[PDB]
Amino acid sequence: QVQLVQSGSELKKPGASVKVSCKASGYTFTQNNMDWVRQAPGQGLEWMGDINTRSGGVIYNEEFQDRLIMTVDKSTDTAYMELSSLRSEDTATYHCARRKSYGYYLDVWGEGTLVTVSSASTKGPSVFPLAPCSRTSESTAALGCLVKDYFPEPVTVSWNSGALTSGVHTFPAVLQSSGLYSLSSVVTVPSSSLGTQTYTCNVDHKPSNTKVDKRVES
Amino acid sequence: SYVLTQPVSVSVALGQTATITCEGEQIGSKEVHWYHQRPGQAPILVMFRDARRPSGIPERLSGSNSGNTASLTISGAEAGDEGDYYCQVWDSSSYTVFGGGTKVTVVGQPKAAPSVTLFPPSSEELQANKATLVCLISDFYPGAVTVAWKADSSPVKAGVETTTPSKQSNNKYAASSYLSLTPEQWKSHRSYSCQVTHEGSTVEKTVAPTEC
Lengths: 218, 212
Known about the structure:
The complex is a heterodimer of chains A (218) and B (212). With 218 residues, chain A is mainly beta. Chain A folds into 2 domains: 3-117, Immunoglobulins (Immunoglobulin-like); 126-217, Sandwich (Immunoglobulin-like), CATH 2.60.40.10. Chain A contains no helices and 19 strands. Chain A has strands at 3-6, 10-12, 18-25, 34-39, 45-51, 58-60, 68-73, 78-83, 92-99, 106-109, 113-117, 126-130, 140-150, 156-159, 168-170, 174-175, 181-190, 199-205, 210-217. Chain A starts with a strand and ends with a strand. Chain B has 2 domains: 9-107, Immunoglobulins (Immunoglobulin-like, Sandwich); 117-211, Immunoglobulins (Immunoglobulin-like, Sandwich), CATH 2.60.40. In chain B, β12 (146-151) and β13 form a beta hairpin. Chain B is mostly beta strands. In chain B, the strands form 4 sheets. In chain B, strands 1, 3, 4, 7, 8 and 9 form a 6-stranded mixed sheet that branches. In chain B, strands 10, 11, 14, 15 and 16 form a 5-stranded antiparallel sheet that branches. Chain B has a 4-stranded antiparallel sheet with strand order 13-12-17-18, with no helix packed on it. At the A-B interface, β5, β10, β12, β13 and β17 of A face β7, β8, β11 and β16 of B. The PDB classes it as immune system.
């Protein structure tokens, strides 16, 4: 399967630099050029540049040339983007995207890496269990995790190390006036399986290197 | 500096046809490619070289390009067609150029009533001298939803943070509302309620500190 796997999201200070990776697999790396495209929140796509994976020569969007270095490691089929002298307006999701062989469209896109540029402190979330106190006999039951007070985005949530997927609903975060985010993830279960199996949410906040596993039901 | 111009937004109803334009000087002499970005996902290629579809794209999507206008037509519109569409060209001097995007909303869709869950503050949070009530609202359509909080029937006009509704992979919307209280405020009332109104129907969930 053609895959383009990107490195994790990060918070950087203004003036610093970020280096994002894109590991390619499932095809011969030197058969396609690689491009980098970014998207600021709520905005459109902005092309940054394209690299020839055989020669390492690049074509840049002129606006980025002075502070963007695109390279490849042909020994690990990985493409890299290093953006320096970071500015607040560089906050965006950076995607690698494969260029069609002998063509000029982008046929496969990576999922993106969110880079936030800010002087604000990173803050890993506090995870609290969500359960009814005594809610009405019914075969449905809602259990959750409140991922509280984190910065920046993004956060990912899974349940029971990824085994639990059915009935899972992870909600988009609210941004509080304090500049911190919070989100919730809920699982709607069968009420009979409540005492039989444990339910644990797994929260990952890459910008702060925070990983939390929280037992909701035992 | 080659420029591509797209309309800001297009609405299309279920089963219907709509066209998104991509204007450029003499764009008919270039090859135009299109991408669809669904809410919270990465873009995907949906049309290349004006009118060719890549793997998995149904024939009800078509493309054309002539003169100064290229276009993408969505026919038989489905809920999954919602999202932002971008046109793109390669220019020998400007290199890769994208249009600004068109937001496509799929309308004429049927009503789905929301599922509402209200959670009280956890014991762990109360230990940390905080209390958040969490009201989760899922599987609704259309997006318009109003959320009101009450403390023993009286409206709460402090400590409420509600999320703007966002689309689920289900093509239905979700939203969250959070009420922040101190542990003393939480235990000072017999009940708290989250009231959600959707297309004229109101549903309510309640929590009681004495049940905790």
